[PDB]
Ligand binder design. Structure first.
Ligand code: HEM
Length: 420
């Protein structure tokens, strides 16, 4: 797979409609994504690009149209992939890229790990880790929030969800980064197929051991609240290792789904607060805004820019005809900035009344399974921030990640001022 090398993105008004290529993974880093999507929403809301490095595709960029595509599982398929391109020549079936009814069967089998009753049992540990992390950070001198907080809290969460050995939690993050980030799939920075195969093999050995280990301990160990515990308590799933593709798939999806999304929500809120510092004063006055703010963070950031589908038949949309078999990209990042839905869509407004109606988790049968865990982690982060810090300043332009899919930060230099 060829690497994507950064070059300067031209002003969108300099281009013919036919030439707008929103698969470029530097649109986010260079700040051009907003104007590019505005033009599409306004002049070509259902747009066909016949020429791209990932092959041809439709872009759907308005909020209401994206809702329709996402909810229309009768017209659009999630199979075989939901990223714009393709993973390497043969690398792990996951229910995010499956249609009902098989989709439903697989998702039902793992969804209890994020049931409300279950999340209630994790809350104390999340809060204690969050507090410990924030207590460890330097004050009045800049540090990189991305490894210090966002990645650190996330890797700990991911290990808790499996019962993954805590001292090896980094491997979950690294394995997930390499998959999420294949150049061939998302225009991401990872171009070595061999390292992916090694990760795939190593992750399958690691999961297979942890399963056999936990079976051995469950003898007389009480089950915890992790996914593997729960799967080996439900009679339908207790044999899951005897179906290798479903076993590796469901576990991998859980880890990949919550890895960069939560990390980038955790980083993105500081970026939005730094761009609209009045909001942080508003928050300090009205701390009961935290739950609505979490929604507004998630909007505003939109951690995953899109999900892709294939048209099961010809479909009329936005004054066009999507043909059977065409790839179709639902641009959440565009829909969350659609002024037809959200007034002043680029402003971060903690008390925005319809923040909860964001599409960052999508809608329909694939709507994010981990949505409540993400919201719980983020509320707790901000509760714990608000107890400790009078200000939280970003001191350098953030470095943003190369990807058409992930909307994230690799460097975020922050200076904290304690309250007393
Ligand atoms: C802010 C954080 C998150 C964002 C923005 C996010 C976003 C998404 C999106 C856009 C989808 C597919 C939606 C669609 O196709 O309509 C999805 C699915 C999924 N997410 Fe998340 N997610 C986040 C956090 C999490 C976490 C923490 C986990 C796991 C603990 C997770 C697990 C999943 C899974 C398993 C699915 C597949 C659901 C299915 O296909 O039925 N997500 N997520």
């Amino acid at each position: 797979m060829p690497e994507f090398v950064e070059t300067p993105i031209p002003d969108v008004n300099t281009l013919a409609l036919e030439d707008i290529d929103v698969s470029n993974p530097f649109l986010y880093r260079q700040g051009q994504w907003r104007a590019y999507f505005k033009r599409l929403r306004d002049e070509a809301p259902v747009h066909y690009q016949k020429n791209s490095p990932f092959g041809p595709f439709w872009s759907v960029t308005r909020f209401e149209d994206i809702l329709f595509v996402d909810k229309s599982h009768d017209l659009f398929s999630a199979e075989p992939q939901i990223i714009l391109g393709d993973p390497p020549e043969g690398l792990v079936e996951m229910f995010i890229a499956m249609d009902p009814p098989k989709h439903d069967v697989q998702r039902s089998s793992v969804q209890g790990v994020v049931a409300p009753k279950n999340l209630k049992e994790m809350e104390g540990l999340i809060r204690s880790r969050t507090g410990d992390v924030l207590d460890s950070l330097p004050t009045d001198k800049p540090f990189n929030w991305v490894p210090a907080v966002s990645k650190e809290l996330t890797g700990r969460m991911l290990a808790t969800l499996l019962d993954f050995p805590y001292e090896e939690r980094h491997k979950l993050v690294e394995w997930s980064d390499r998959m999420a980030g294949a150049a061939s799939a998302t225009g991401g920075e990872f171009a070595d197929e061999n390292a992916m195969f090694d990760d795939a093999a190593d992750m399958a050995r690691s999961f297979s051991r942890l399963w056999r280990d936990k079976e051995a301990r469950r003898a007389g160990e009480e089950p915890g609240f992790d996914l593997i515990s729960l799967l080996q308590s439900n009679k339908e799933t207790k044999d899951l290792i005897n179906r290798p593709m479903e076993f590796i798939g469901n576990l991998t999806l859980l880890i990949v789904g919550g890895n960069d999304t939560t990390r980038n929500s955790m980083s993105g809120g500081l970026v939005a607060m730094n761009e609209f510092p009045r909001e942080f004063e508003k928050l300090k006055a009205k701390p009961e805004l935290i739950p609505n703010m979490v929604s507004e963070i998630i909007r505003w950031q939109t951690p995953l820019a899109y999900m892709r589908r294939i048209a099961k038949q010809d479909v009329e949309l936005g004054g066009q005809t999507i043909k059977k078999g065409d790839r179709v990209v639902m641009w959440y990042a565009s829909g969350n900035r659609d002024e037809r839905k959200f007034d002043n869509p680029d402003q971060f407004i903690i008390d925005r009344k319809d923040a909860r109606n964001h599409m960052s988790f999508g809608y329909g049968v694939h709507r994010c399974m981990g949505n409540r865990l993400a919201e719980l982690q983020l509320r707790i982060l901000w509760e714990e921030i608000l107890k400790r810090f009078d200000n939280i300043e970003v001191v350098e332009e953030p470095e943003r990640v190369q990807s058409n899919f992930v909307r994230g930060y690799s460097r975020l230099m922050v200076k904290l001022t304690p309250n007393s």
